């Protein structure tokens, strides 16, 4: 329309239309094609692990990993495995070689499923080796939604001055990097404040190094979004934009988390929520081995920590937001799996 969010004009078609370079290009694949293949290559390893666990009479360690095992089991036993497979199986390594970072994750994690389940491999240590975990955030499978966020942050900050931005779970700054590269392509100081936050300060040095072009304009402060932001030295209701890319789901109680996001935003401020729209085999492989994926189990998020856009919409309205004002999806069709959701913080 002439739809605005945070006072600037933006539409789903505006963001979703954007074309960006993907590793998939260099192999001549469409993003939907690659995503298909990524999850098909993943399905092979899932199927192999399920059959191996069953053949050897193995059971997982009795912790959150059983939830990972269950999803894998359901994926195979529901015939979903077969379906994904039938759209093949020792161009597998040749396929994987062309799947870039996702292929690397698959190559690293796929053969280790049984080891992780049975406690012979520390999943987090394993996937963090060579900063692979950090690089998966830069992968094709999640870069379009991050670019949507960047594009919206560019729209906002280019059209409005002295915008205050906070990023939750910035991590090693993959989203941050997409944002800065778009909003400040050569150091251009573009907002009143970019507050770079994470649960642990251990990221910050690496972040400062990776983002040295914007060193000064970034502030760095620890923020555990599951706890009250005020107690952690943040000024409530001072932010115009909060960016949270695939972090909000990794919390125990979404309404509590969202309530805390609300505390930081001024009335009318925008919440940029970048989230997976649905569980895919690749995401279960990659993140399901990690304890944080199962943070929502106690409140019924047991297949994964994820919520649909419709669920986020309702949760947002319940926690003082407008709901989803705008959804921009990474892809159309069956392969769609991630999105930008924009929401407005409401005064109450």
Largest CA distance in the chain: 62
CA-nearest of 38, 6, 4 to 265 is 6
Burial readout 291-323 (b: 16 or more C-beta within 10 A, e: otherwise): ebbbbbeeeebebbbbbebeebbebbeebbbbb
Phi, psi of 347 (to 5 degrees): -65, 145
User: What token pair was written down for 281?
Assistant: 């085999």
Residue found by looking up tokens 């000024």 in the block:
235
Pairing relationship of beta strands 326-329 and 265-276 according to DSSP bridges = unpaired
- Residue 9: what are its φ and ψ, rounded to 5°? -75, 125
Read off the tokens for 71: 């999803």
Residue 66 CB contacts under 8 Å (≥ 6 apart), including other chains: 60
The beta strand positions in 212-289, using DSSP E, are 218-222, 239-245, 265-276
Three-class secondary structure of residue 336 per DSSP: coil
Q: Residues 154-186, buried b or exposed e (16+ Cβ, 10 A)?
A: bbbbeeeeebbbbbbbbbbbbbbbbbbbbbbee
- Where would I find the H helices in 86-168? 92-98, 100-109, 113-117, 123-128, 132-136, 140-159
CB 285 within 8 A of CB 42: yes
Packing angle, helices 140-159 and 31-55, rounded to 10: 140
Tokens of 316: 């947002």
Cα dihedral 13, 345, 283, 135 sign = positive
Residues in CB range of 278: below 8 A, 6 or more apart: 306, 308, 336, 337
Distance between start and end Cα atoms, the chain:
28
Unique residue bearing structure tokens 């304890």 = 291
Tell me the C-alpha distance between 27 and 86, whole Å.
21
Q: How many CB atoms lie within 10 A of CB 271?
A: 28
Say if CB 196 and CB 207 are below 8 A apart: yes
Mark 121-151 as b/e (b = at least 16 C-beta within 10 Å). bebeebbeeeebbbbbbbbbbbbbbbbbbbb
Rounded Cα–Cα distance for residues 116 and 174 (Å): 26
HSE-CB of 190 using CA atoms within 13 angstroms: 22
Domain borders along the chain are 1-24+130-348, 25-129
User: Helical H runs in the chain?
Assistant: 12-16, 31-55, 65-77, 80-85, 92-98, 100-109, 113-117, 123-128, 132-136, 140-159, 174-183, 204-210, 254-264, 281-287, 309-318
Q: How many residues does the chain have?
A: 348
116's tokens: 């992780």
């Amino acid at each position: 329309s002439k739809q605005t969010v945070g006072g600037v004009h933006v539409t789903p078609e505006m963001l979703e239309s954007v074309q960006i370079p993907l590793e998939a290009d260099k192999v001549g694949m469409t993003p939907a094609e690659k995503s298909k293949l990524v999850n098909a290559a993943t399905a092979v390893y899932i199927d192999m692990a399920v059959e191996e666990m069953r053949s050897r009479g193995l059971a997982p360690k009795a912790d959150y990993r059983v939830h990972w095992w269950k999803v894998m089991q359901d994926f195979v036993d529901s015939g979903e495995g077969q379906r994904v497979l039938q759209e093949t199986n020792q161009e597998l390594e040749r396929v994987i070689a062309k799947l870039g970072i996702e292929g690397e994750v698959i190559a690293r994690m796929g053969p280790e499923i049984v080891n992780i389940l049975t406690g012979k491999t520390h999943a987090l240590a394993h996937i963090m080796r060579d900063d692979l975990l950090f690089r998966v955030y830069l992968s094709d499978e999640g870069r379009r939604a991050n670019r949507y966020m960047a594009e919206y942050a560019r729209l906002l900050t280019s059209q409005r001055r002295d915008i205050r931005i906070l990023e939750i779970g910035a991590g090693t700054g993959g989203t941050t990097s997409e944002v800065l590269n778009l909003c400040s392509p050569n150091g251009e100081s573009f907002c009143a404040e970019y507050m770079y936050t994470d649960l642990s300060p251990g990221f910050f040095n690496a972040a400062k190094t990776t983002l040295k072009k914007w060193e000064s304009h970034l502030a760095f402060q620890v923020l555990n979004i599951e706890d009250d932001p005020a107690g952690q030295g943040f000024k409530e209701h001072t932010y115009d934009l909060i960016i949270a890319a695939n972090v909000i789901h990794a919390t125990a109680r979404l309404t509590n988390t969202l309530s805390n996001v609300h505390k930081l935003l001024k009335p009318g401020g925008v919440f940029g929520l970048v989230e997976l729209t649905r569980l895919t085999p690749f995401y279960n492989l990659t993140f399901g081995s990690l304890s944080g994926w199962w943070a929502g189990v106690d409140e019924g998020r047991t297949e994964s920590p994820l919520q649909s856009p419709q669920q986020w919409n309702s949760l947002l309205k319940q926690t003082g937001f407008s709901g989803v004002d705008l959804a921009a999806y990474d892809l159309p069709g069956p392969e769609r799996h991630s999105c930008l959701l924009l929401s407005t913080a409401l005064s109450n």
